[PDB]
DNA sequence: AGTGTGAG
DNA sequence: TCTCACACT
C-alpha cells in the first residue's frame with residue numbers, strides 16, 4: 001500500500017491580511033477591534049477583513065459595517081482605496097508580493113490567493129537532514145508549532161499543553177531514520193518557523209501555516225491554530241482528526257459536491273468515507289472524484305504544488321446592482337473605459353516587472369434578471385496595452401446583446417461588467 | 428471557445 | 436447592492 005508520505009508540503013496564510021496591511025501603515029489600528037471595508041455609503045460599507053480583536057465581538061466578513069458597529073461599538077475601520085469609481089487593491093497586491101518574495105527564498109511557492117501560498121519543502125527538508133548529521137531537534141526550534149492530536153494518554157493553560165504535546169512528539173522521534181516521514185514533517189516545521197520569522201521581521205506581518213504531506217492537509221492544518229501559530233499534521237493524526245471532521249471543511253468539498261457527498265452517501269465526517277470502495281465512490285461522483293475521495297479520506301492527495309508565483313490572469317470588475325444598473329450606451333462605454341484604464345495600469349506594471357504580455361482579453365457582463373454571476377463571456381484579441389482600444393473592443397464584442405430597439409438605451413440594464421487579461425506570453 | 432464551481 | 440484557479444463540454 002502507498003502511504004502518501006512522499007512529499008512535505010506547507011500552506012502559509014497571512015492572518016487578517018488586509019487588516020494587517022492597514023495596521024502596519026496606520027499604527028492607530030494596531031491591537032484593536034478593527035475591520036477593512038469597501039464603499040463607505042451603503043450601510044457604512046461591506047466588511048471584507050476582520051481583526052481578531054473584532055472577531056471576539058461577532059464581527060465577520062460579508063457584514064455591513066453599520067451592523068458590525070451594533071456588535072462592536074469601538075470597531076475601527078480602514079477603507080479600500082477607491083479609483084475611477086471602483087475599489088482598488090494595489091496596496092494588498094504589493095503587500096502580497098512582499099510576502100511571496102520572502103517565501104521564495106526558501107522553496108518554490110504556488111501563489112494560491114493574494115495572501116496564501118503552498119510550499120514544497122521535500123528537498124529543503126532533505127538538505128537540512130544531512131546538515132543535521134544525526135543530532136536531535138530541540139523544541140526551541142519550534143516555538144510556535146502545534147502537533148495535532150497531542151498530547152495523548154496519561155496543565156490547563158493554552159500554550160502549556162502545546163509544550164507537552166510538542167514534547168511527546170519529539171520524545172518519540174526516530175531521529176536516525178532519514179527516510180522517516182514524521183521526522184521530515186518535523187524538519188519542515190522547523191523551516192517554516194524560520195520562513196515565518198523572516199516574514200514578520202522583514203515586513204511586520206504575522207501569519208499561520210500548516211505542515212503535512214499534501215496541500216489539503218497543510219491547508220486544513222493551518223487553520224487549526226490561527227493566528228500566529230503553525231500546526232503539524234502527521235499521517236498518524238488523520239484517522240482521529242478525520243473521525244469528527246465535517247466533510248465541508250476539506251478544501252473543494254465546501255460546495256455542492258461536498259453537499260452531495262453528505263446526502264447521497266448519508267455521512268457527516270471525512271473518516272466515514274473509508275468504508276466505501278473506490279469503485280463505489282466512482283459510481284457516485286465520477287472516476288476522478290471517487291479516486292480523489294478514496295485516497296483523501298485516508299489522508300492521501302497528489303495535487304502538486306505548482307511553481308507559479310505570479311497570477312495567470314489580470315482582471316477588473318464592478319457590479320452595478322439594484323437601480324444602479326446600466327441602461328445607457330454612453331453609461332456602458334464610460335465604465336468600460338474606467339475598467340480598461342485600471343487594466344492598462346496593472347498590465348503595464350506587469351510587463352515591466354515579470355517580462356510577460358497578455359495576448360487575449362475576456363469581457364463578460366451580467367444582465368438584471370439572470371442569476372448566474374456571469375450572464376455571458378466572450379473573448380477577443382489584446383494587442384496593445386491601450387485603455388481606449390480595449391474598452392472599444394470590449395463594446396464591439398458585446399454591443400449585440402442589447403435587446404432594446406433604440407440606440408442610446410441598453411436593455412436589459414447591465415448589472416455587472418468584467419474585463420480580464422489572459423493568455424500570457426513571455427516578453 | 429464558453430459555462431459553472433470553489434475559493435480567498 | 437472583487438478577484439482569480441480550475442474542470443467540463
Ligand SMILES: Nc1ccn([C@H]2C[C@H](O)[C@@H](COP(=O)(O)NP(=O)(O)OP(=O)(O)O)O2)c(=O)n1
Nearest residue numbers: 013014015016017018019048049050115226435
Ligand atoms: N470572501 C473574501 C475572502 C477574502 N478576501 C480578501 C481580504 C482578506 O483579508 C484576504 C485574505 O482573506 P482570508 O485568507 O480568507 N482570511 P483573512 O486574512 O482576513 O484572515 P484569516 O481568516 O486568514 O485570519 O482576501 C475578500 O476580499 N473576500
Ligand SMILES: [Mn+2]
Nearest residue numbers: 013014015016
Ligand atoms: Mn488569511
